[PDB]
Amino acid sequence: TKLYCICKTPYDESKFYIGCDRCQNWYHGRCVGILQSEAELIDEYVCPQCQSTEDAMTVLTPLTEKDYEGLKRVLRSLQAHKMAWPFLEPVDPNDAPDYYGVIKEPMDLATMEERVQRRYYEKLTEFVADMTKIFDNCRYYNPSDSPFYQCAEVLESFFVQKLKGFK
Template sequence: MTSITNSAKQYNHIICHKKPVDKNANIDERNNLDHKFIFKEEREDNIRWRIINNDGTRENLFLLTGVKELISTALPKMPAEYIARVVYNHNHYSLVIIKDPNKVIGGICYRPFVERNFIEIVFFAVNGDHQDKGYGRRLMNRLKHFMRDVVKIKYMLVYADESAIGFFRKIGFTTNITLEKEIWKGYIKDYSKAKLMQSTFIAKINYAETKEILARQKQAIREKIARTIKPPIIHPGLQRFKNGVKSIDPMSVPGIKESGWTLELEKRAKESVKYRADYLLMLKIMEDLENHRSAWPFRLPVDPITVPDYYDIIKDPMDFSTVRKRMENNRYLTLKEFAIDVQKIWDNCKYYNTKETYYYKSAETLEKFFTDLLLENGIKLP
C-alpha cells in the first residue's frame, strides 16, 4: 500500500497548491452550475480536500475520528465498532472535505485493490447541513479523477441500500456489473439487503471539472446558435378560412415548405414522443420493482451452481438485470412486450418453488405490486 499512500500525498500536495480560481471568470456561467454553492466555497478557500489513512500521524488520526463520527451520524443503525474498525484500518483510505478549522463535513471511505483494478466504496456520507449542495457529487468526481489518473484504477464497486440506489445512479453507477465476478468475489464484503453497483471510469472525461466543462459546452452551443439563427420572417395571416374553407394543404401555407417540415416528419415526431413516454414508464416501473423490499431474489439470474437443476426445469428464465439490458438495447417496442417479460419472472419462480417457500411468497407479493402498477397506467396483461 506504500504506492497508494505516496500517490495520496502527491494528490494532497497538488490540490493544496492548485492554481487559484479566476475570480473574474464568467459569473453567469458559474451561477448556472448545479454545484454553485460548493464552487463558491472552493473559490473562497473555505474548504479543503484531503486523502487520508491511518498512518499513525496525529493529524490523520484526528481527521479519521471526524470521518468515524460523520458516518456514525449518517448511519445510526450501523454498529459503531464496525465503523471504527473500517475507518481506522490501515488498508482503507478516506477522501474528505475539511472546513476550517479541521471539521470533516463529507467523506468517502474506500479500499483500493490495485492489482485487481478496482476499489470498493465502504462508506459515503455528507454532513446534514451540507447535503443537496453538490458536495456528494464533487467528492465522487474527485475520487474518480484520483483513481483513474494517479492510481490507474478503472472500476469502482459499492453496495447501495434501497435509499441510496437513486443517488448512485445519478453519479454514474449502474447495477449492470461488467467486472468479472472472480475478480471481486471474496474480496469485498457482501450485504444481503443491498445492491451491488459499478462505475467504470471513462478515459476522456475530466472528472475533476465535469460541471465546468458542461457549462462551457452549453455556452458555446448557445453562442453558435445565436450566430447562425436567421431573423424570423413574418407572413400575413391566411384569408381563405374567412371564405368558408374547412381545410387546406399544409404545404401551401407560406413558410412551411421553407422550414423543412413534412407530414412524414410530423408522423415520426409523434411516434418518437410516444416511444419515449413508454420507455420512461418502463424505467419508472423497474425502479419501483427493484426498490421493493421483496425484490432481492429477482435482481440477477439464478446461479446454476447454487441451484443446479433450475435451467433444466425453467426453459425461458428472466430477471430484472436481463429486462434492463433488453430495455437498453431497445428490445421492447411496446409496453406489453415489456410487461410479458417481467411477468415471466413471477411465473418462473412460482413454477419452480413450492407455495410455502419465501421465494414463492415474494413472487406473489411482487406480482400483485406489478399488476397494480400496470393497471394504474392503463395496461392489462392477456
C-alpha cells in the same frame, strides 16, 4: 335524419346527448351512464365501446419515448422492493443446478433492464410478458408456501398496481 346511440334511435331534442370524440357518433347520456353535470366536467368524451378499445389497445400500441422512460422507472421501483430480492439477478448457475436444468427461459429484473435499455420491447404486452415470466418461473419452481413463491405473489401484486394508468 339519422340513427344515433347504441339504441339506434333518431334525434330527440328533448333528450340529453353527448358526442364521442373518437367515433363521432352521438349517444343518449342516459344510455352510456353520464348526466349533463358530469359531462360539464370533462373536455373530451369517449363512449364505452371506444373506451374499451382504448383500454384493450394500451398493451398493443407502439412504445413511445416517454413509455420507455416509464418502463425504466417501473423497474427501478420494483428493484427497490423488499420482496424483490429473489428476482434482482439471474440465478447463479454454479449454485442452483437443476434450476437451468428445468428452466430454459429464465427472466430477471436485470435482464429486463437490459432489454429496456436496448429497446428489445416494442409493445407494453412484451414487457408484461417478461415480468409475468419472472413470477410464473418462480411459482413453477418453488412450493406455494415457500418464501420464494410468496415473494412472487407480493411483487406481482405491487407490479399490477404500479402499472395502472401507464399509457
